[PDB]
Design a protein around this ligand. Structure first.
Ligand SMILES: CN(C)C(=O)CNc1ccccc1
Length: 164
């Protein structure tokens, strides 16, 4: 089984009327839920407006994220993968001088919709510096990318991190 932390979705912005049961009935549409909790005050039992769900597999997390926007009990909520900042841009290092835009696009477009690819060049000489930035239309692409142990693009093992 994949590590549980990689199977969780933190759901912010809940309606205070959402319950463990209604959150579960909603998110079970995209996979088997091994856990589903609405966070509540320990004294009043009033909802804290957020909670979490745990799927059986990472593929199911992907399916839930691909089904956004989620309207749960009448309110659009904000699911995010667990920490294991929320940004839309990555740094890609170690691509050397022969990696081109299409190598980066063909690979990273499978994580999400790309808005910008910036291959970095030397301000003085114009030579490629061996790193790039990729901006996506949404943060979940970045979140999937940075939890991978490895990234291989154009035969190179790359270092990938969130950018600003
Ligand atoms: C045969 N296997 C293991 C797969 O197809 C998994 N694929 C997968 C896709 C997205 C997220 C996590 C996993």
């Amino acid at each position: 089984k994949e590590p549980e932390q990689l199977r969780k979705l933190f759901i912010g912005g809940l309606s205070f009327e959402t319950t463990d049961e209604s959150l579960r009935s909603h998110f079970e549409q995209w996979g088997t839920l091994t856990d589903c909790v609405v966070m509540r005050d320990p004294n009043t039992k009033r909802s804290r407006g957020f909670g979490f769900v745990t799927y059986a597999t990472v593929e199911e997390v992907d399916a839930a994220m691909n089904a956004r926007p989620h309207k749960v009990d009448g309110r659009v909520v904000e699911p995010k993968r667990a920490v294991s900042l929320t940004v839309k841009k990555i740094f890609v290092g170690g691509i050397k001088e022969d990696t081109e835009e299409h190598h980066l696009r063909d690979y990273f477009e499978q994580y999400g919709k790309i808005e910008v690819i910036e291959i970095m060049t030397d301000r003085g000489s114009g030579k490629k510096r061996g790193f790039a930035f990729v901006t996506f239309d949404d943060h979940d692409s970045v979140d999937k990318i940075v939890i991978q142990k490895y990234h291989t693009v154009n035969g190179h093992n790359c270092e990938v991190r969130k950018a600003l």
